[PDB]
Write a protein that binds this ligand. Structure first.
Ligand SMILES: [K+]
Ligand SMILES: [Mg+2]
Ligand SMILES: [Mg+2]
Ligand SMILES: [Mg+2]
Ligand SMILES: [Mg+2]
Ligand SMILES: [Mg+2]
Ligand SMILES: [Mg+2]
Ligand SMILES: [Mg+2]
Ligand SMILES: [Mg+2]
Ligand SMILES: [Mg+2]
Ligand SMILES: [Mg+2]
Ligand SMILES: [Mg+2]
Ligand SMILES: [Mg+2]
Ligand SMILES: [Mg+2]
Ligand SMILES: [Mg+2]
Ligand SMILES: [Mg+2]
Ligand SMILES: [Mg+2]
Ligand SMILES: [Mg+2]
Ligand SMILES: [Mg+2]
Ligand SMILES: [Mg+2]
Ligand SMILES: [Mg+2]
Ligand SMILES: [Mg+2]
Ligand SMILES: [Mg+2]
Ligand SMILES: [Mg+2]
Ligand SMILES: [Mg+2]
Ligand SMILES: [Mg+2]
Ligand SMILES: [Mg+2]
Ligand SMILES: [Mg+2]
Ligand SMILES: [Mg+2]
Ligand SMILES: [Mg+2]
Ligand SMILES: [Mg+2]
Ligand SMILES: [Mg+2]
Lengths: 208, 246, 132, 126, 116
RNA sequence: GAUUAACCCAAGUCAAUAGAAGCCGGCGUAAAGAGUGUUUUAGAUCACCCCCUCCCCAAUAAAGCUAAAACUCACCUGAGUUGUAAAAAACUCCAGUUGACACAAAAUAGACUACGAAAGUGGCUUUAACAUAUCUGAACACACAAUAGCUAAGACCCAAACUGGGAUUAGAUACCCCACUAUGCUUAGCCCUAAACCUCAACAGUUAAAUCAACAAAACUGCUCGCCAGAACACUACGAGCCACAGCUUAAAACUCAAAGGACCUGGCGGUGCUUCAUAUCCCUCUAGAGGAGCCUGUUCUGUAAUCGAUAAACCCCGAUCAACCUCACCACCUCUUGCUCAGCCUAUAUACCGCCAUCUUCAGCAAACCCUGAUGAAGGCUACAAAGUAAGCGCAAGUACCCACGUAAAGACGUUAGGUCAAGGUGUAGCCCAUGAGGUGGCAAGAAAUGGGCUACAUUUUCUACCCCAGAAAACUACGAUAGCCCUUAUGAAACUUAAGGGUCGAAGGUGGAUUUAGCAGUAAACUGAGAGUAGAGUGCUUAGUUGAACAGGGCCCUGAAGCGCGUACACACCGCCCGUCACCCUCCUCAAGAGGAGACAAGUCGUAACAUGGUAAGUGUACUGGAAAGUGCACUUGGACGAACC
């Protein structure tokens, strides 16, 4: 890295700097005073202080990117969100008054809830023992869990099974399905959970 | 190089009583410091640093080891910790060196005035191969002209427009300053980054010092040193090696 | 291991001059160029002819002054003037040195069709930078 | 290390030399290299503690025996006086005893130098 | 401390040897390293509760939320406890002293199985 | 070997043979304390005065008894139990509880060190009982002697050679699992062997020194007995003795060799221990690929009259930043002979080299000169509350280049691989001189097959068009997909079916690729664009500039390595090491009913890998059974293995 180790990652949060001094604790005050003497990396172009910034959606867009084509990936993401919102509006209008309250129309909430539902709880690690390889169930960190959800969503949307269907439409359909706890990705999570439950007897093989 | 004088006379008798230790200067220094500590026992930071081992060797005209330097520095710190007098402080200050604490505070551009009397600040920025020179006026409607073109026409990508929005929005000054920036070189994103850096640097002249510090901490005023890495011979790219066959 | 123009280490008895003691990667960093002409500059020609002239001059001076040269020659080209600055040893009689100076200067002038001067700096012995 | 400072001070006061730090290998048997070809080695070495800090004989005892330097030495009941030229059996741990030894040796050296100066002055006078 | 008189096979010892050590019974000037304890699989009980609830609820997370949260909390506690255990091993509070400091102490006072 | 010279002796020289010259030395590991105890004849002075553990703990034989755990039986519950790295086989008259329950074996005590001559002896009780008022002493006897084994009769819970089955394996006559027998136990006889070793004889005495090869368990003295005298043949043959009959004890010789051996030093290595790490990295991970398709290009193989070299990491768009003629060194034919050169050779040798480099190195050590330790051996040389190291110099580092102090370059020693290049050039040695030299003309440089690296794709995050990011169409046999095939034109050139570019025509394999595998930690990977070197022209290649621009970066010592401390070592060109046994020929010797066996040498090929590292099942002794073979297993014993050496 061209940044010396002295450099620190910048913190982009307006509320963090607009916080009143009186509310600040001694630890926070000391941290703020110390940060005046450190070196700070340049703010990355990906993230800004815009109120419409979503780190989850930015990460999903980066994972969808192919060959550094972030314009196309961002276009696909915004088209997917627009398609989700349009489908939700269509369902809202076509539904009765009772069902209108339950129908969700925020694409961001739908996306976050779909990823949260797609998140696996217990993973499998291949462990060598006695010359064999065993799929030992293991706990998963939240980071790996979110990454697995995102990667499963993207891989399922990129599957060749869907013919001539554009990525925004496929991704919107999968997001709506996952938001309702249905679809191939939720089935993949269930299959992982079932395999872990079956291999539960191998859990003692783990040494960590 | 500084050379130590002959350490014994015609008769052969060495001048210093610690000659046969082989490190008479260092051990004499340690002896004096220990004696000062004993005297102090009998009686009962930011702008300075301890000298490095090389400085101590230059002072003593004797080769030293890292552990010897550690022992000396520990003894000096123990000397400082006590209720030292004026002479005991002068002895310490003999070895203490001065460190220039360069302020990380961003330099504020002077506020210049045009023919019409409007106030403005000019700055420059670089991102990869892109160089941008920006002028930010104290009063404005938020209009930004890039090479005489509106920034929404010049930047048809939402990411670049968000990059432009970042400095003003971070200090809650959207639509309050008019900007005229000329950028040359690099791609669209490098140009947007350079314009962002120049705009933030210029806008520092019209915000409070705390706001300038916040912008610096947010990364709006650091010149991004990340530039393209040269391709090396014998490998496909900057880091990509040729496929290796075993 | 790189071998180019490197005097390898030994038991510490081999004397090396400043020119020899520095590896090629020290050129323009710790040592200069033994020939100075405008041939290799951008937008210039006749570089190959200048290189061939330099090679021939070095070989000719090495052969004409056997065992006298104490270091590499320094060739300078100003206009059509060709200056050869050479560090020689104080062993030959000055009569022979002057004879060789006149001889080489006239021969090179009539060979390369340019005024050639030969400046000799004499040293009692080879200048030693270090012992490798 | 309890008496390094006292012994160094005594050596400085009496005009003689002291070694109370880690005895580097060869300070006596390799002095011509460490110091120089014209270094003058001590003509008498006085050990106020013949044992090193790991309860073995000080290497300087053996090295001074090699270099034919007579060694005066205070030897406790756990020391080895075989190679010490003039061993003095005595306690080497109590501060009182060590101070007594330092006083006696310093006074003897000072009296010797005073007598040498007096004899030289008297012989020049006559 | 067990007696060593008449144990080893030595001249003048009439009886057959009691001890046959493969190394001399002489104290070394160093102690063994701080041996790690082989890690065991953790949070197995909470994992079992979660998996049994999955089997009873057809792997529906909505019904099993409580047990799933318990298992996740146990996993996070186990990871943080492993990190804290590494920190404690660096600290060395649990033992009477770290092996490094003990080795330093033994270096200061070495064993002397020889004469001098 | 000849030749020149030299050396020794000399009327001799010296090839063969024989003789002369050998016991006061040792026995823990080199061969050697005989498995143990006790005599007479004898020997010794350690006998007498004169004496400090007498006695008790697990000596021995006999008789009796039994606490825990088994087996079996009985009731009641369940359909499983056993088995391990994982399984299978096996048993379900099985498993669990409870109760009854032995000719088997004797937790804890034992952190004790006792008894016995040794072998051995560690549950309890009782009886008998543990020689010698100097010492050594029997291999010419007498009496004992672990385990194994034989004989005869019994017991039989459990274990277990053999055997059978299951598994593993290339095979598995083993390791792993299951069942069972001889056997382990009792009684009466035999057998008489052990790494029967504490490899250290009994008795008396010393710690004085001249302590002392090394390691081990310090060095010795007096006396006596036993044993030993290069290795292998050889715990063998013959003879003799024995209750032993495939046996045990004593025990040679011939052929052969210049060694064998014991203990160490250093290094390497270990399917070696502990600890800490790996930061594109060893594993799980993240991204893009390779391996599947077509094409370009290199290589192997085949082919031709037709180069050469690299060819594991460290070869394979490599010498070439480049072969149509030239280049060219290849082949065929023709020609010249002091030849462009005070000749020439791209002839052999890179295992003679210089020159330039690869590689560990994505290391950090190399080393002059001294000094000290090892008893002055090979060797080694550090502890900071410091204990023998000091060290010039090279390297790292620092400085320097690009955009910083970061990063990338560059650098990167001594050495390793007799690593690459004799074809850059030079050059040692050897080789040709009417040719292995020089010139001219023409020509090969292909693909049965296999493979490496790239390029293009297999499309919808796509294809075409405009634009360079607010669009319109296409979207499966006229879709995506050739830079390929065929035809034509142009460029260069003297020469283009051949090289390049363009146009036309065609629209192929292919539908995200098995085992396996490469690279990347940030402006990096990925994708896109441009320029340069060299050419007359020529690469999908190389060098280089820029643009858009990510994901993971957290856990682990399980896998592979590194470092620190050790351990082992029969290896030392150093584990790609060494090494064992069976199955052919020849040679020598020995024992032989001349057929054959044995030993050694010769040393092959074959089948395994038994030993040396925890040698991948620790090794070995005795013994029994079994096996193609080293060998496997049972039982007891040994360390000539280790168990990491405070607690954790
Ligand atoms: K390929
Ligand atoms: Mg290199
Ligand atoms: Mg004392
Ligand atoms: Mg022996
Ligand atoms: Mg015996
Ligand atoms: Mg007797
Ligand atoms: Mg027996
Ligand atoms: Mg039986
Ligand atoms: Mg059984
Ligand atoms: Mg079995
Ligand atoms: Mg019994
Ligand atoms: Mg035994
Ligand atoms: Mg036998
Ligand atoms: Mg026999
Ligand atoms: Mg017989
Ligand atoms: Mg392929
Ligand atoms: Mg070839
Ligand atoms: Mg070849
Ligand atoms: Mg040709
Ligand atoms: Mg030729
Ligand atoms: Mg070579
Ligand atoms: Mg480099
Ligand atoms: Mg460097
Ligand atoms: Mg070779
Ligand atoms: Mg070769
Ligand atoms: Mg020819
Ligand atoms: Mg075409
Ligand atoms: Mg033409
Ligand atoms: Mg083996
Ligand atoms: Mg084995
Ligand atoms: Mg065995
Ligand atoms: Mg068997």
């Amino acid at each position: 890295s061209r940044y010396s180790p002295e450099f620190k990652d910048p913190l982009i949060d307006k509320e963090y700097y607009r916080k009143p001094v009186e509310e600040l604790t001694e630890e926070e005050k000391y941290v703020r005073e110390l940060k005046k003497t450190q070196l700070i990396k340049a703010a990355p172009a990906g993230k800004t202080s815009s109120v419409f910034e979503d780190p989850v959606i930015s990460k999903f867009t980066n994972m969808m990117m192919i060959g550094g084509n972030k314009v196309l990936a961002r276009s696909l993401m915004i088209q997917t969100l627009e398609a989700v919102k349009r489908k939700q509006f269509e369902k809202y209008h076509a539904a009765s008054a009772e069902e209108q309250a339950t129908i969700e129309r925020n694409p961001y909430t739908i996306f976050h809830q779909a990823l949260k539902n797609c998140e696996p709880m217990i993973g499998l690690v291949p462990i060598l023992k006695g010359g064999r390889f065993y799929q030992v169930p293991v706990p998963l960190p939240d980071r790996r869990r979110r990454f697995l959800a995102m990667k499963w969503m993207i891989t399922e949307c990129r599957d060749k099974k869907h013919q001539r269907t554009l990525m925004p439409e496929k991704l919107s359909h999968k997001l709506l399905e996952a938001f309702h706890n249905q679809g191939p990705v939720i089935k993949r999570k269930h299959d992982l959970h079932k395999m872990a439950e079956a291999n539960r007897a191998l859990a003692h093989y783990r040494w960590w | 190089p500084r050379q130590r004088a002959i350490q014994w006379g015609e008769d052969g008798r060495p001048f210093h009583y610690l000659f046969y230790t082989g490190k008479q200067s260092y051990y004499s220094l340690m002896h004096d410091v220990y004696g000062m500590l004993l005297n102090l026992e009998k009686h009962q930071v930011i702008g300075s640093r301890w000298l490095i081992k090389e400085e101590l060797e230059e002072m003593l005209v004797e080769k030293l080891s890292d552990l010897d330097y550690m022992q000396f520095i520990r003894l000096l710190e123990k000397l400082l910790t006590s209720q030292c007098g004026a002479a005991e402080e002068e002895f310490v200050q003999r070895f203490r060196r001065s460190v220039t604490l360069e302020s990380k505070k961003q330099l504020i551009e002077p506020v210049q005035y045009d023919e019409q009397g409007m106030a403005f600040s000019k700055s420059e920025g670089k991102r990869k191969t892109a160089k941008a020179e920006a002028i930010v006026y104290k009063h404005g409607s938020g209009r930004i002209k890039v090479n005489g073109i509106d920034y929404q026409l010049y930047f048809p990508i939402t990411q670049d427009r968000e990059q432009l929005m970042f400095p003003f929005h971070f200090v809650d000054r959207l639509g309050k300053h008019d900007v005229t920036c000329t950028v040359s070189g690099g791609g669209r994103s490098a140009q947007a980054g350079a314009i962002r850096l120049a705009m933030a640097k210029a806008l520092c002249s019209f915000v409070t010092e705390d706001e300038v510090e916040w912008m610096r901490q947010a990364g709006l005023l650091t010149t991004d040193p990340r530039v393209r890495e040269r391709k090396k011979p014998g490998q496909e790219g900057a880091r990509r090696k040729f496929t290796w066959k075993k | 291991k790189n071998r180019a123009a490197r005097v390898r280490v030994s038991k510490g008895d081999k004397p090396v001059t400043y020119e020899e003691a520095h590896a090629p990667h020290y050129i323009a960093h710790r040592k200069g160029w033994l020939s100075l002409h405008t041939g290799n500059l951008d937008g210039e020609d006749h570089a190959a002819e200048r290189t061939v002239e330099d090679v021939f001059l070095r070989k000719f001076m090495w052969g004409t002054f056997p065992g006298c040269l104490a270091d590499q020659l320094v060739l300078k080209r100003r206009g059509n003037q060709l200056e050869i600055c050479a560090v020689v040893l104080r062993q030959l009689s000055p009569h022979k040195y002057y004879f060789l100076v006149g001889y080489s200067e006239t021969l090179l002038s009539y060979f390369y069709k340019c005024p050639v001067r030969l400046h000799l700096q004499t040293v009692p012995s080879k200048v030693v930078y270090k012992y490798l | 290390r309890q008496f390094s400072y006292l012994i160094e001070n005594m050596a400085r006061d009496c005009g003689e030399y002291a070694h109370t730090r880690y005895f580097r290998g060869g300070m006596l048997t390799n002095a011509r290299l460490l110091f120089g070809p014209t270094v003058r080695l001590p003509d008498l070495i006085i050990f106020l503690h013949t044992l090193n800090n790991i309860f073995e004989p000080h290497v300087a005892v053996r090295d001074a025996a090699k270099m034919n330097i007579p060694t005066v030495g205070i030897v406790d009941t756990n020391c080895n006086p075989c190679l010490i030229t003039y061993p003095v059996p005595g306690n080497d741990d109590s501060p009182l005893a060590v101070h007594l030894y330092c006083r006696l040796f310093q006074t003897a050296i000072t009296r010797a130098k005073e007598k040498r100066q007096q004899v030289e002055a008297l012989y020049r006078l006559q | 401390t067990p007696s060593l008189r008449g144990r080893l096979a030595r001249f003048g010892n009439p009886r057959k040897p009691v001890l046959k050590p493969n190394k001399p019974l002489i104290l070394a000037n160093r102690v063994g390293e701080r041996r790690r304890e082989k890690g065991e699989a953790t949070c197995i009980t909470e994992m079992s509760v979660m998996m049994a609830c999955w089997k009873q609820n057809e792997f529906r997370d909505d019904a099993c939320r409580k047990e799933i949260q318990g298992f996740l909390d146990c996993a996070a506690r186990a990871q943080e406890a492993r990190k804290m255990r590494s920190i404690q091993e660096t600290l060395g509070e649990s033992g009477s002293l770290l092996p490094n400091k003990l080795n330093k102490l033994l270096q200061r006072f070495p064993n002397k199985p020889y004469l001098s």
